[PDB]
PDB file of C-alpha atoms in Angstrom:
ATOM      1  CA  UNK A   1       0.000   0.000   0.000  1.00 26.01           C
ATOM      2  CA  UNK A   2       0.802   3.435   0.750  1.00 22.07           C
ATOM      3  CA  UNK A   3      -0.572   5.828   3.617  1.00 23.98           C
ATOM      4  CA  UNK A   4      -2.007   8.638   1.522  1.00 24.57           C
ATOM      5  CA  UNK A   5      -4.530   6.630   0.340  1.00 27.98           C
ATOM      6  CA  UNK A   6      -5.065   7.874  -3.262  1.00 30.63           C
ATOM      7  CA  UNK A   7      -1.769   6.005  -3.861  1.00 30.77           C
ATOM      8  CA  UNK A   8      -4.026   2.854  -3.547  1.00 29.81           C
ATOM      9  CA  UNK A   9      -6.605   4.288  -6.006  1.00 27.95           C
ATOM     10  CA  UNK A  10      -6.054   1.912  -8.966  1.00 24.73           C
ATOM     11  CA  UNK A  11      -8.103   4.952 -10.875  1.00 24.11           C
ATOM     12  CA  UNK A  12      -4.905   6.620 -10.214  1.00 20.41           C
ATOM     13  CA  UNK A  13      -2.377   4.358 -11.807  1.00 24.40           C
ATOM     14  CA  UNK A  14      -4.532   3.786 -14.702  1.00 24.89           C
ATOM     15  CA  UNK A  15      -4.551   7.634 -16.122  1.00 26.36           C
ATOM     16  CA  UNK A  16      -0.700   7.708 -15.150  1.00 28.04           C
ATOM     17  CA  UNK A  17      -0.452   5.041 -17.487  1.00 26.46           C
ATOM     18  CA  UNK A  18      -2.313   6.373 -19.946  1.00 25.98           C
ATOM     19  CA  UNK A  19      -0.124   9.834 -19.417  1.00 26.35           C
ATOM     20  CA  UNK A  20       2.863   7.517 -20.193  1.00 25.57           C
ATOM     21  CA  UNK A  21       1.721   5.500 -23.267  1.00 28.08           C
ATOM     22  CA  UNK A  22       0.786   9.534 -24.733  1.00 26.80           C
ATOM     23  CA  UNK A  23       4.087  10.918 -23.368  1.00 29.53           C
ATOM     24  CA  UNK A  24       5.924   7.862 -25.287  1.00 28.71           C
ATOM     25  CA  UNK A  25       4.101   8.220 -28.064  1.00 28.75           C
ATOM     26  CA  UNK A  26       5.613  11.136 -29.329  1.00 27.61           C
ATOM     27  CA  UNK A  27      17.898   8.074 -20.644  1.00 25.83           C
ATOM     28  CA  UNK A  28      15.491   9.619 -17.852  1.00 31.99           C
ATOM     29  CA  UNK A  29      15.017  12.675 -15.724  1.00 28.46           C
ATOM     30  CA  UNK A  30      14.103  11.447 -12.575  1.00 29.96           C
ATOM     31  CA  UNK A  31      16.050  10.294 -10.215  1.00 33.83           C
ATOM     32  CA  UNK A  32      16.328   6.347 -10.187  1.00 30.47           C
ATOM     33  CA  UNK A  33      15.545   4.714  -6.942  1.00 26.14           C
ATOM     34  CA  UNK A  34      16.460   1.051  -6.324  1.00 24.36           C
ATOM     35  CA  UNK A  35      14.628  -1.349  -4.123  1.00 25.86           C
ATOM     36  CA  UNK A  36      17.034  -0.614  -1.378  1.00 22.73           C
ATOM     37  CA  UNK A  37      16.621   3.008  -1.664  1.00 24.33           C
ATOM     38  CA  UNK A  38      13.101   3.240  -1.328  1.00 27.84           C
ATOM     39  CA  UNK A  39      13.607   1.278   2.096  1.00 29.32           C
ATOM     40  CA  UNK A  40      15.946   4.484   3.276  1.00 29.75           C
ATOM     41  CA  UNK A  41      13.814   6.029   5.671  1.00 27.28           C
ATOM     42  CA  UNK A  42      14.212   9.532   4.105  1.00 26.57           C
ATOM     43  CA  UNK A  43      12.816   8.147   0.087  1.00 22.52           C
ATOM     44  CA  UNK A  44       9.330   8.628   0.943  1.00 20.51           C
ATOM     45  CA  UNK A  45      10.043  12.781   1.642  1.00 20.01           C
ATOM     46  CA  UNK A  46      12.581  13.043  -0.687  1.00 18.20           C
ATOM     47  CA  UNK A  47      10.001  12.302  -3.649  1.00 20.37           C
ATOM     48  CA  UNK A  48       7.507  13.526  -1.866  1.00 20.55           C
ATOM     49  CA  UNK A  49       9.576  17.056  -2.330  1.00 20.06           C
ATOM     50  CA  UNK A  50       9.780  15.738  -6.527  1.00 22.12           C
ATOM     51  CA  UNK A  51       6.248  15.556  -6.377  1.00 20.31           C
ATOM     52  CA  UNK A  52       5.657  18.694  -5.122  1.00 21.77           C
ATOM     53  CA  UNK A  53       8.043  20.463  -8.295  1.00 22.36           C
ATOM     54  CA  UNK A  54       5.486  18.047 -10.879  1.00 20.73           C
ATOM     55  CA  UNK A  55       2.382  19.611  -9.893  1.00 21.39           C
ATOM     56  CA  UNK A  56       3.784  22.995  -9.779  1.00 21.79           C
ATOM     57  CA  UNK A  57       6.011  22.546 -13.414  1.00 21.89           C
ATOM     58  CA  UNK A  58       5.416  19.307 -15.294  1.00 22.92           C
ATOM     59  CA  UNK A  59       1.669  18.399 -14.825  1.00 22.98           C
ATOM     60  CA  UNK A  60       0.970  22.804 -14.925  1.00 22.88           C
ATOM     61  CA  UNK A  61      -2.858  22.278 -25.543  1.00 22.97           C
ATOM     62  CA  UNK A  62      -1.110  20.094 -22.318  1.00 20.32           C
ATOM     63  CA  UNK A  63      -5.305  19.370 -21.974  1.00 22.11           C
ATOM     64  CA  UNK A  64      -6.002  18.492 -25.243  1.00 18.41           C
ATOM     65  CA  UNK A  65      -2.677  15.754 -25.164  1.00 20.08           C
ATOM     66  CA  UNK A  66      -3.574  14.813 -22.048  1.00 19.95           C
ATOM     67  CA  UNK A  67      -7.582  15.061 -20.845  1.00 21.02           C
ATOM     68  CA  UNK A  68      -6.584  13.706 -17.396  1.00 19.89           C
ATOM     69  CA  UNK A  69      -3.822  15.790 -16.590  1.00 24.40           C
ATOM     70  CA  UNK A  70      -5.611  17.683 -14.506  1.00 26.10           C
ATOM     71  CA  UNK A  71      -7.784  15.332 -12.522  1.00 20.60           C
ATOM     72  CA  UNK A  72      -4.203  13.540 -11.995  1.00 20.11           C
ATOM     73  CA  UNK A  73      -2.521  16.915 -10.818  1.00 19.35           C
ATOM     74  CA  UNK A  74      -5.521  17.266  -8.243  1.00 17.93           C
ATOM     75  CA  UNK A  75      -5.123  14.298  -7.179  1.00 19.40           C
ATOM     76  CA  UNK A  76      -1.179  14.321  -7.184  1.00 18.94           C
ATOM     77  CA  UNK A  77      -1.018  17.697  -4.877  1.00 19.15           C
ATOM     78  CA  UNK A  78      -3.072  16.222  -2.374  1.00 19.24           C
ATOM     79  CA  UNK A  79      -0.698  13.287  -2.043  1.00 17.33           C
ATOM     80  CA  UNK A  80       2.050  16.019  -1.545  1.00 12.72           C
ATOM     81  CA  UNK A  81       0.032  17.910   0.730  1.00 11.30           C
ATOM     82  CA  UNK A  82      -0.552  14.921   3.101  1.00 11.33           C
ATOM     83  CA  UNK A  83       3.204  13.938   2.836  1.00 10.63           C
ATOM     84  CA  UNK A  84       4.310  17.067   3.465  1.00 10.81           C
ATOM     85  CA  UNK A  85       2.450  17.000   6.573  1.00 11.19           C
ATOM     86  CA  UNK A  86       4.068  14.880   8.315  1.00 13.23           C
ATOM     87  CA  UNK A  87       7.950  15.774   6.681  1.00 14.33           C
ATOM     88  CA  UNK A  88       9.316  17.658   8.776  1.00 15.47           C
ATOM     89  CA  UNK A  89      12.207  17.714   7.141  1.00 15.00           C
ATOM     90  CA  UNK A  90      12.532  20.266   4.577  1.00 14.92           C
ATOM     91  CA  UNK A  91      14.312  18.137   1.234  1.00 20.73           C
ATOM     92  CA  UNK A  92      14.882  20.881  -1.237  1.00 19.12           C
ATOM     93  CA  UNK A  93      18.347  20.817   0.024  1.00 17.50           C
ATOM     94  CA  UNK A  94      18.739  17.056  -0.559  1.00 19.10           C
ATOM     95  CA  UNK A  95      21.252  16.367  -4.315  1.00 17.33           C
ATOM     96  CA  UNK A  96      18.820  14.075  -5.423  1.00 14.05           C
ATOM     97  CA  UNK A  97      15.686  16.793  -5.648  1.00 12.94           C
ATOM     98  CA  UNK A  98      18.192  18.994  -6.733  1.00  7.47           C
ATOM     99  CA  UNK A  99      19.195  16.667  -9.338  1.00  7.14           C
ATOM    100  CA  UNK A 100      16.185  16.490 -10.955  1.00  8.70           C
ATOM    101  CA  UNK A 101      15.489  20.194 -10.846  1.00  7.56           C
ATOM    102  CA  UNK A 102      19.053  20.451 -12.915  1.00  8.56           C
ATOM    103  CA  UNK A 103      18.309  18.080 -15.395  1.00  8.29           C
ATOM    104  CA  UNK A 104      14.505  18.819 -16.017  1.00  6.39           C
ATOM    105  CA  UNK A 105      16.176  22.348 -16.849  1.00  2.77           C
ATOM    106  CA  UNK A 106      19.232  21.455 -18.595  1.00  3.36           C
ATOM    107  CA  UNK A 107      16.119  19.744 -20.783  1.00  6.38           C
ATOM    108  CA  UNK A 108      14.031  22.768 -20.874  1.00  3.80           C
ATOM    109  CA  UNK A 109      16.824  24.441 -22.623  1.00  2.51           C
ATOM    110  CA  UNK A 110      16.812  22.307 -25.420  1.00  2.92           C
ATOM    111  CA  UNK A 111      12.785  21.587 -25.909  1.00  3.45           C
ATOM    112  CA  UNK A 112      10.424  22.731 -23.284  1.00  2.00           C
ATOM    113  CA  UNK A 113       7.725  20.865 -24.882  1.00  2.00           C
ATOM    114  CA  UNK A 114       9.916  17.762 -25.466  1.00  2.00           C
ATOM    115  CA  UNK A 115      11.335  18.207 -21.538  1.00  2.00           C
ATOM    116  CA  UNK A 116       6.931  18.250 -19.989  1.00  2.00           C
ATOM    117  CA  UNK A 117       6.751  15.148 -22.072  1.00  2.00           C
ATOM    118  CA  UNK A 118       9.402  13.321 -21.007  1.00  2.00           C
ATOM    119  CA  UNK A 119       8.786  14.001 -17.270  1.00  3.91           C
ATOM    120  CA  UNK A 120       5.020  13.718 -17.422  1.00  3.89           C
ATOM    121  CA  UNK A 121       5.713  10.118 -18.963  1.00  3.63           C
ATOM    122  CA  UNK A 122       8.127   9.927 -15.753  1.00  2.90           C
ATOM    123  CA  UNK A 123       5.006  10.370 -13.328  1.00  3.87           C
ATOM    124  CA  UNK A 124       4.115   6.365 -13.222  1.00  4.95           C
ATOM    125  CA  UNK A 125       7.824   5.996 -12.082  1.00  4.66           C
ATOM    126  CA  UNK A 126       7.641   8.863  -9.290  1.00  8.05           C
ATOM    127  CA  UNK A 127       4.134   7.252  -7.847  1.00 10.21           C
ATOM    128  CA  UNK A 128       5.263   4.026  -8.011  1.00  7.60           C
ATOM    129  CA  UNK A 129       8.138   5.647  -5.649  1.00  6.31           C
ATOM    130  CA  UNK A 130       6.493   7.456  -3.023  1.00  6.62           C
ATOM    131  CA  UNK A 131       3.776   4.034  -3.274  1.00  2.56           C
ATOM    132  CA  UNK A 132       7.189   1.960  -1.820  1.00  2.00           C
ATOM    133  CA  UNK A 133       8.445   4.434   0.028  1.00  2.00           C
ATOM    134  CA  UNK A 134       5.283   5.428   2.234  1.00  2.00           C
ATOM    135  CA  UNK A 135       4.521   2.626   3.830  1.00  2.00           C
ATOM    136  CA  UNK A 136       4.439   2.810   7.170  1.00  2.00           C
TER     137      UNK A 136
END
Protein backbone atom coordinates (compact mmCIF):
# COMPACT_ATOMS: atom_id res chain seq x y z
CA UNK A 1 0.00 0.00 0.00
CA UNK A 2 0.80 3.44 0.75
CA UNK A 3 -0.57 5.83 3.62
CA UNK A 4 -2.01 8.64 1.52
CA UNK A 5 -4.53 6.63 0.34
CA UNK A 6 -5.06 7.87 -3.26
CA UNK A 7 -1.77 6.01 -3.86
CA UNK A 8 -4.03 2.85 -3.55
CA UNK A 9 -6.60 4.29 -6.01
CA UNK A 10 -6.05 1.91 -8.97
CA UNK A 11 -8.10 4.95 -10.87
CA UNK A 12 -4.91 6.62 -10.21
CA UNK A 13 -2.38 4.36 -11.81
CA UNK A 14 -4.53 3.79 -14.70
CA UNK A 15 -4.55 7.63 -16.12
CA UNK A 16 -0.70 7.71 -15.15
CA UNK A 17 -0.45 5.04 -17.49
CA UNK A 18 -2.31 6.37 -19.95
CA UNK A 19 -0.12 9.83 -19.42
CA UNK A 20 2.86 7.52 -20.19
CA UNK A 21 1.72 5.50 -23.27
CA UNK A 22 0.79 9.53 -24.73
CA UNK A 23 4.09 10.92 -23.37
CA UNK A 24 5.92 7.86 -25.29
CA UNK A 25 4.10 8.22 -28.06
CA UNK A 26 5.61 11.14 -29.33
CA UNK A 27 17.90 8.07 -20.64
CA UNK A 28 15.49 9.62 -17.85
CA UNK A 29 15.02 12.67 -15.72
CA UNK A 30 14.10 11.45 -12.57
CA UNK A 31 16.05 10.29 -10.22
CA UNK A 32 16.33 6.35 -10.19
CA UNK A 33 15.55 4.71 -6.94
CA UNK A 34 16.46 1.05 -6.32
CA UNK A 35 14.63 -1.35 -4.12
CA UNK A 36 17.03 -0.61 -1.38
CA UNK A 37 16.62 3.01 -1.66
CA UNK A 38 13.10 3.24 -1.33
CA UNK A 39 13.61 1.28 2.10
CA UNK A 40 15.95 4.48 3.28
CA UNK A 41 13.81 6.03 5.67
CA UNK A 42 14.21 9.53 4.10
CA UNK A 43 12.82 8.15 0.09
CA UNK A 44 9.33 8.63 0.94
CA UNK A 45 10.04 12.78 1.64
CA UNK A 46 12.58 13.04 -0.69
CA UNK A 47 10.00 12.30 -3.65
CA UNK A 48 7.51 13.53 -1.87
CA UNK A 49 9.58 17.06 -2.33
CA UNK A 50 9.78 15.74 -6.53
CA UNK A 51 6.25 15.56 -6.38
CA UNK A 52 5.66 18.69 -5.12
CA UNK A 53 8.04 20.46 -8.29
CA UNK A 54 5.49 18.05 -10.88
CA UNK A 55 2.38 19.61 -9.89
CA UNK A 56 3.78 22.99 -9.78
CA UNK A 57 6.01 22.55 -13.41
CA UNK A 58 5.42 19.31 -15.29
CA UNK A 59 1.67 18.40 -14.82
CA UNK A 60 0.97 22.80 -14.92
CA UNK A 61 -2.86 22.28 -25.54
CA UNK A 62 -1.11 20.09 -22.32
CA UNK A 63 -5.31 19.37 -21.97
CA UNK A 64 -6.00 18.49 -25.24
CA UNK A 65 -2.68 15.75 -25.16
CA UNK A 66 -3.57 14.81 -22.05
CA UNK A 67 -7.58 15.06 -20.85
CA UNK A 68 -6.58 13.71 -17.40
CA UNK A 69 -3.82 15.79 -16.59
CA UNK A 70 -5.61 17.68 -14.51
CA UNK A 71 -7.78 15.33 -12.52
CA UNK A 72 -4.20 13.54 -12.00
CA UNK A 73 -2.52 16.91 -10.82
CA UNK A 74 -5.52 17.27 -8.24
CA UNK A 75 -5.12 14.30 -7.18
CA UNK A 76 -1.18 14.32 -7.18
CA UNK A 77 -1.02 17.70 -4.88
CA UNK A 78 -3.07 16.22 -2.37
CA UNK A 79 -0.70 13.29 -2.04
CA UNK A 80 2.05 16.02 -1.55
CA UNK A 81 0.03 17.91 0.73
CA UNK A 82 -0.55 14.92 3.10
CA UNK A 83 3.20 13.94 2.84
CA UNK A 84 4.31 17.07 3.46
CA UNK A 85 2.45 17.00 6.57
CA UNK A 86 4.07 14.88 8.32
CA UNK A 87 7.95 15.77 6.68
CA UNK A 88 9.32 17.66 8.78
CA UNK A 89 12.21 17.71 7.14
CA UNK A 90 12.53 20.27 4.58
CA UNK A 91 14.31 18.14 1.23
CA UNK A 92 14.88 20.88 -1.24
CA UNK A 93 18.35 20.82 0.02
CA UNK A 94 18.74 17.06 -0.56
CA UNK A 95 21.25 16.37 -4.32
CA UNK A 96 18.82 14.08 -5.42
CA UNK A 97 15.69 16.79 -5.65
CA UNK A 98 18.19 18.99 -6.73
CA UNK A 99 19.20 16.67 -9.34
CA UNK A 100 16.18 16.49 -10.95
CA UNK A 101 15.49 20.19 -10.85
CA UNK A 102 19.05 20.45 -12.91
CA UNK A 103 18.31 18.08 -15.39
CA UNK A 104 14.50 18.82 -16.02
CA UNK A 105 16.18 22.35 -16.85
CA UNK A 106 19.23 21.45 -18.60
CA UNK A 107 16.12 19.74 -20.78
CA UNK A 108 14.03 22.77 -20.87
CA UNK A 109 16.82 24.44 -22.62
CA UNK A 110 16.81 22.31 -25.42
CA UNK A 111 12.79 21.59 -25.91
CA UNK A 112 10.42 22.73 -23.28
CA UNK A 113 7.72 20.86 -24.88
CA UNK A 114 9.92 17.76 -25.47
CA UNK A 115 11.34 18.21 -21.54
CA UNK A 116 6.93 18.25 -19.99
CA UNK A 117 6.75 15.15 -22.07
CA UNK A 118 9.40 13.32 -21.01
CA UNK A 119 8.79 14.00 -17.27
CA UNK A 120 5.02 13.72 -17.42
CA UNK A 121 5.71 10.12 -18.96
CA UNK A 122 8.13 9.93 -15.75
CA UNK A 123 5.01 10.37 -13.33
CA UNK A 124 4.12 6.37 -13.22
CA UNK A 125 7.82 6.00 -12.08
CA UNK A 126 7.64 8.86 -9.29
CA UNK A 127 4.13 7.25 -7.85
CA UNK A 128 5.26 4.03 -8.01
CA UNK A 129 8.14 5.65 -5.65
CA UNK A 130 6.49 7.46 -3.02
CA UNK A 131 3.78 4.03 -3.27
CA UNK A 132 7.19 1.96 -1.82
CA UNK A 133 8.45 4.43 0.03
CA UNK A 134 5.28 5.43 2.23
CA UNK A 135 4.52 2.63 3.83
CA UNK A 136 4.44 2.81 7.17
Amino acid sequence: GARPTPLDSSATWNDLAAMTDTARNETRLLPYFSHDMLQEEGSCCINARILKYYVNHVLEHTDMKYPMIRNVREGLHRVEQELQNHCKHDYSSHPLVKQFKRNYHASAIMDLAAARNKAIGETNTLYHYLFESCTP
